[model samples]
Each structure stands twice: as structure tokens, then as C-alpha cells.
Target: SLGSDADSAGSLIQPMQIPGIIMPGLRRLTIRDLLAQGRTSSNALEYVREEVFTNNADVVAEKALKPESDITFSKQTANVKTIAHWVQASRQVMDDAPMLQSYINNRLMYGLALKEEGQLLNGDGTGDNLEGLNKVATAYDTSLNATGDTRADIIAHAIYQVTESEFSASGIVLNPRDWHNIALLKDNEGRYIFGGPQAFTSNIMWGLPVVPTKAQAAGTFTVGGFDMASQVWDRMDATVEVSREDRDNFVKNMLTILCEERLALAHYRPTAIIKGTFSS
Candidate 1:
């Protein structure tokens, strides 16, 4: 019954065992619940998965269509790119600590979830995972100058990036600290500059929802079409595996707990995403 809910069978009281001084059966109130914001439904990022056996790469093509005069036909070709897949995973050994198994598993799961979210945003496409937004080449890039670099300026740059291509910005991604700074910005007259009281609670920014995460480094950010510009291919969800069959881990009274997922990110219209920096 090591993996089963034994509390339902008989005894309900379990002793606390971890160093964190957490109460038994009482879940930690501060656990970071990871949500794949800005990468899924209703957001700008589109989700696509490859079929079995066929080519694993997802091919994306895009083009700009402009209107022409009567009888004058203008033909154009699409900008195409192939997106490769990346597998992401996080694993831990449960044998090192003397803690309640349930709580231990909860901690591991939480760690895995946080790792997944960070990886999705910042995976450098170097080793095991696909390239992240920051690593990808976009149509536009900017850095805040010493004289007057601000969040508004970055937004303006992104707007121009997409607008110049006949497209509109769909969303904005920023680090929590940078975004908080922008949200707290106020005018010389003491009034909040952007959304006022609304900015504190709402995620919307300049008519688009803002996705803030640690995946982006402080002082850097991205703005673009979440759905139209890029795609996330999810081959699997976080699958948990528990085993005592690995090496000396079993002999040492340890269990190997592993969590993993298969996914890839592709940018069809690199210009659709604008990467920029915030002024200090």
C-alpha cells in the first residue's frame, strides 16, 4: 500500500517527517501551481501535435497578402519554416528524505510542474529542448536606450514590428518583476499611467493579455501573436513513474520518481514575435 491511499482503509493520523515543519494532511498554502498561460487555448499560442510514424517536424508557412488595383494580379509566396521537437522532463529520488510519502510526492509534482513552465518559456534549443522565444529570431528587436527606455517604448516597437508587416500584436510576455514595475508606473501628477487600479488585478496590457513568467530573464520581454506567430506541439503530458528498480537506489531504500513530457515549439512568422529589453 506504499503508493495507495492507505488513509481510507483505517488510520487517518500521520506524523510529520520533513524539515519544512509542515502539518500532516494540511497542504502547504503556498505551493506554486503552474499553469501553461499564453501557450494554450484562447491565448495567442497555437497547440499542435505530430501524428505517429510520419515526419516528426511540424512545417509552418506564412505570407503577407496585400490588395491590388483592378485587373492587376499580385502573386506572393509564403514564408516557410520547419519546427523541430524537444523533449522535456524532470526527475527526482524520493529516498533521500524521511517525509510523508504523500507530501513528498506533492513536492516532486510541484517541482516538475514549475520546471515544465519555465522550460516552455525559456528552453534554449541547445541540448534537450526546442528553442525558446528569446532564442528564436524575430522580425524585430530593440533595446531600451540610456536616455528614455521604457515599457511603453517596447510596446511601441512591437506594434511597429507587426504593423509594418500588416499584422497586429496579439499578446505580450514579460517577467513578473519587469511587468510589476511597468504596472506601477505613474505620471508626474500622481496618477497611474496605464490601467490605474485595473492593472493591479487584470492581466491585460494595451488591449492584450500579458503572460508573466520566470522563463524570461529580468529586463527582457516579448510581444506578438501567441497563436498566429508560433505553435507548441505537445506529444505527451507530465507522466509520473515510480520505481525502486534502479541501481543501488533500491538497496539504499530509495524510490526513483520521474516526470517527463514531449513537446516542441515552432515560430512560423518570426517577425510576429518581437523581442526587446527594458530600461533599467
Candidate 2:
């Protein structure tokens, strides 16, 4: 009667199987989303940026001498830079774990996006780096009146700097810490200037969209015509591939999963982007 007892039947028992669910890391991925996108067939983006324009237009009477205005441009080039990474997994693991392949692909792609976001904002342009917006952006004019010492005042003035160059600012890029400080700002009456704790709305400040991201360095801000002053030219869109032919992967029963993309950033109007550091 006890021949098939619990202990004796343990070897025949089946364990429950649960599908894997990945918990993605936190990332805003903001700057790239706000920029203009385009495709390029060449390895480099070649174009000219207006260096100077002397406007001499003035009110004149009929038959009067016309004013002559002069304009100049500087040619620039942005070469496509590649971003890539790979992971190796045993062939048996790849076969046994149905979700492993996709998990690796997702992680690899996210890594690329994370790096791309940083480069779009901070690339030094030396070597294979793409000249980032912050590198070419006009420095904030400290002489401009901010009207107040608050972060909001500084950001509003930054927007003014962009408009002073005759371009409308499309967005504000802030580090999460800076944005948080502004978000928590209060009035003398103890009321929140942005909204109450219960308030839920998209981030907006000074009539421009607020992009809070870690990609932007803390204690600094970038206000710009992201949609109008710059562009991301994709020479090769992101792709994922798996191969066993890399090195000794085949012999070792291992496979390499790779993710990569090639792209370039063009800062067309440097004056349209204003970059500044927050005052202590």
C-alpha cells in the first residue's frame, strides 16, 4: 500500500516551469528621441554651417542706394561612428533556455542605446567620437539677467540665449537631480510651483518639453532647438546577429550574439543650442 509513497515517487514528480520575465534597467533614453533623424548612404556627413551673416537691411527711400549684406559659412564633416558589443553563450544553454537569445539581444541593444544617448550629448568628436551638441553649443551668456537665482531662472535664461540667436528652443535637457530640485520647488505660501505631489503630467517648463536624463551631467543644463538645429544620420541602423563562426566558438560549442549600429550627429546651428552649468 505504501509502495508508491511520497518519498518513493519523488523521482517521478515534475517541477512547475515558469516563463522568464526580464526586469529592464532604468534609463530615460531622452536626447535621441528629441532629435531629428535621417538616413545617409555615405560614411560621413558633409555640410556647411553658417559662420556669420551681416545684415545691413534698413529703411530706405525709393531710388536710394541699397545696403549690401554679406554671409559666410564653414564646412564641417561628421563621420559615422560604430557602437557595438557582444556576448557569448554555450550552444547547449542557448538551446535549453528559449528566452536566453532574446534576453541577450535586448540587453545588447539597450547598451547601444545607452551609449548612443551619451554620445549625442557629450561626444568629444576626437578620434571616432561624434561631435556632440554640448561640445558645439553656445555657452550661456552669464551677463544675461536671470531675474532670480533659481534653477528655473537659469533655464529660462538659457532659452532666451537660444532665441537671441533667432532660433526657438524646442526642449530642455536636465539631469534628474537638477530637474528634481526644480520639481520640488515651493512658494513662500508653501504651494508647489509645478504642481502638488498628486499632480501627474508630462514634464514641461518655460513652454518647452523637459527631458530629464542621466545622460546629461549633473549641475549642468542644455536648452536647444533639438528638432530644428541638429540631426542624427544613420548610416546603418541597429542590428543583432548570432554566429558560431567567431574564433573558436564553433569548436567550443559557443555562439556570439552581437548588436551594433553606425550613425553620426550633425550640429547644424551651434548658436541654437545653449549649454550652461548650474550655479552653486
Candidate 3:
């Protein structure tokens, strides 16, 4: 009776584009909107190469005969590869559910996003994984000071690192818990540190857009010129399908819901990203 063909999950035959009544305006898969796209990673270890030089190498007064300073340059490469992420659902639920299909689609998208976020923030660049920002030895590490005002220090340190390379910070990413702490902070005079809660119409923090991602750990955060610092290689977009050919599922009147994708993350400028752990 669970997988009966008649009146069984008839509403789920077509994927619904309409937003769900439950969990409306929920946080969906992110991380793609922040980075530049249109990249492809075909090899086991494709390298994203970049060149960086110090700012003092070119700042000199105009003169009839000026001496040229040595323009020191350094080469850095980020290893990248296609990563596969997927999700699956059972047919019994597909055949007897009312809201399971929408939930299933959201789960698939969430899985894809979560995997990409984890790779970009924590990947170690071994065994077919992309080199992540937090794993870079050269990336700047800012230490959060307890009772020393994280709102000011976090923003300052991130900007300082990026500006040292003559690049301005574009955005920041952190866990919602950390942001909640930051948002709840108050100055000695008793006013909200950033502003009243109502002041935050958007996810702006310290004059830059702040993204709250569960992907980042609670005590740590990342800041960078995300639009220019990294690229995502889309080997294949996330796709969903239903099939009944696995393990006599069709004979049992069952279907399998599955979703998968192949993608990679690449960060070109290590200094452009600054990561930190707060003491509080």
C-alpha cells in the first residue's frame, strides 16, 4: 500500500518552483554567489597560479634619472579538482508523502552547498580535494581578543592584511553564533556596538557585507576579497533524478530520489583572505 501507483504521491510528479509554506525564506545553498565562476577542473590536480609583489616596489618620486628598485615577486599555486556530492531518497516516502518532495529538493541543494562550503573553508588539498583558505599557511591569522572589542578588531585585522597587498577586503564569512555575539555587543556607554538590531537591514558588518554560514566554525571566521580571491570550477551543476531500477525497487513499486554534482574551489591570493579565532 505504501508504493501504490494510484493516488500515491500524485502531487510530487513535477518539481515545484513555488516556495514552500513551511520553512519559507529559509537559508539555501550559498558560497557560489560570492566567488567568481566559469572555471573548469579536468585533471586530478589542476593548479591555479598567481603572482604577488610588494607595494613598495613601485612607489618612487618622478625624476629625470630615477633608480629602479627590485620588484620582488612570488609565485603561489592552489591545487584544485572536481569534488562529487550527492543525496538520495527512498521510494516509500516518495509514494506516501505530502511535503517530502519539497523537503527532499531542499536537502539536495543544502548538501551541495554544505560540501562546497566545507571544502573552501577546511579542505587540506590532498586526495582529490581543493586547497582551502583556512589551510593556507601563508594566509594571515588574526587573533580575537576577549574584552578587547571584536567588532573593531575583526574588521581592522582583515582589512589590514588585504590592504597590505594593495587589495581591499570585499566581504566576510562566519557562523551565525559568532555574528549573533557581535550583534549583541554594546559599548561602554551602553549603545549597541554596531548599531541597534533594527539598523541591520542587510548583512552588513563593518562597512562590508557579512555572510552567515554554518560552514564556518563557531569560534572562527574568514574575511577576504571573495569575488577576486577565489574561483569555482563547475564540472557539472547539481541534478536530481528518480529511478526504480536499483535492487528490485521497481518490483516493490518503489522509486529512488537522487541528486549529485561535480565542482571545485580555487583561491588564488592567500593574503587576500584573513582567518581568525575569537577568544570569547
Candidate 4:
């Protein structure tokens, strides 16, 4: 269903771990062992860590004394209330379904799949929209170069702009395949943390074809797309007015549920449970 369906669905947290930065490894015969030992050096066969990884302001300030980090904006702009507002705005996006070919505006939309998360429905009435709602879409856009590499470029551009750089100016870091490993992380100030491994947000960048390449990009970090499950509307019975019979029991139940959820999510995991209710 992707993000374009309003029907019933289950939420599965698909996480892509941070890619292990294999800083050019070398094997040499050291003194002790005549055999082989490996060491990682400060070099990458391909891929840079800064363009999308981290803002090198502190680097410029420390090394060149350029004082790029000194350019401070109003910290007041980052307050709790502002954060809440952002959370609300993000939910709007995660909850959006596909546009049903409406001729609005110049009769144009950015990327049609953007609204649908690349999922459309098939003729069988299934909400599967990999290619404009049904059927397979070319892994590469043929109008362009149409090569697998070019297709990756198109997807990468969409990820940085539509996924990362839209609200947050996330630089393109990975070589057309490193979003899952490193996009949604954050610093102490709640800002995204980059500089180590690109796939930390998505799993698309690990292994690819032989002829790989990267541009002036970075293993970037920043506030990414708004996640919806983090927020939602709740309803309460309006029948019980300010003068409720007993609010203590209700409050206790709510708190207990919340605390239990927190505990379970902390570290506990188990097989799915399905039990029948007992007779009254």
C-alpha cells in the first residue's frame, strides 16, 4: 500500500543499519607474524563522507580558520513548540494517498510516484503500485540514459530532494545507493548525525554492480521525512463531561498501557501471540 492507501494496514519497522565504512584495508607482514595482518587506512576506493554525511563547518573553522561555524542562526527557532509543529506537518505527508489523475494547477505534479511512494494498484484491485499503480516499472527511466547506473542516479536524485533535501537540505552522499544506512539519525540537538556509513537509513547501498561511481556528494545527515506513526489523533467519549464518575481508573489504565508499551519496546521481543478470551 505504501503511503498512498487509506485502507487497513500493518506497520512494520523496516530498518537499514549503518554501513560499515571499510576504510581501504591493507595486508602487510609485520614483525611478529610472518603471516598477514590487515589495517584500515584513510582512503576510500569511492565515496566521500562529508557532502551528505556532515556539515564540515567545524572543520573549516578548525583547519582553515574560516569561521564557517561561527555563522550562528537564532537558536530560538528550535524550540519544543516548533518541534511539535514539525511533527504535525510530517504526519500529513505519511498519510497521503496517490493522486487520481486530477488536472490541478498546471496539470502537473512533481513525481507522480512521490505521492504514492512508487506504489500503485493493479487491475486485480490490489493496492500495489510499483509502476504508476500496477505492473512493473522500469528500474531505469528510459527517456534518460536508461542504463542501470543512470536509473540509480535518477533514484538517488529523488531520494536527496524528495526524501532528504525537501525540508532538510540533505546533501547527496552515497553513490546512488546509500540512503537506508544513514539518513534518519540525529545529534544531541535532534539534528541528524552523518559522517559514518551512508546506508544507516536504508539498505540500498551495500552491494551493487561493478561499474559504480559517486559524485560531489556526502554521507549526509539531517531531519528527514516526517514519520506518521509518531503522531495520530485520539478520541474520547464526549458523553462523560467534566463531572465524570471516576477518572482515576481510566487514567491508571492509560498509564499502565503506556508504561507497558515502553517496557516491551525497550528490549523484550517474542513470537506473535494469539489467545482466546476466557468465559465470563
Winner by TM-score: 2
In terms of lDDT, model 2 sits at 0.87
Worst 10 residues of 1 by lDDT: 29-38
267, model 3: CA deviation in Å?
1.7
What is the Cα-based lDDT of residue 143 in candidate 2?
89
Residue 81 local lDDT, model 4: 10
- In model 3, how large is the Cα lDDT of residue 112? 62
Misplaced by over 4 Å in model 3 are: 1-25, 39-41, 44-103, 137-149, 196-202
Q: Pick the candidate with the highest lDDT.
A: 2
lDDT of 3 by residue, 1-280 (tens): 6553557865557655876555645564455687888646463224535344334444456674544433444454444455444444566676577788877777777766668778877767687776776776245444433346556576667666777657778878778888877777787777786667677445787688888888777887778887887777777676777677866777776666667667667667766877776655
20: Cα error in model 4, Å: 38
Residue 224 in model 3: shift from native, Å?
0.6
TM-score of each: 0.58, 0.88, 0.70, 0.16
**Backbone collisions counted per model:** 5, 0, 0, 26
How good is model 4 by TM-score?
A: 0.16
- Which candidate do you rate higher for TM-score, 2 or 4? 2
Give residue 234's lDDT in candidate 4 (0 to 100).
13
Model 4, span 103-217: residue lDDT tens:
1211122222122221211112132211111121112222333334322344343333332222421122232233432345455476545334443433332222111112202
Which pairs of residues have clashing backbones in candidate 1? 44-226, 44-227, 45-226, 45-227, 139-271
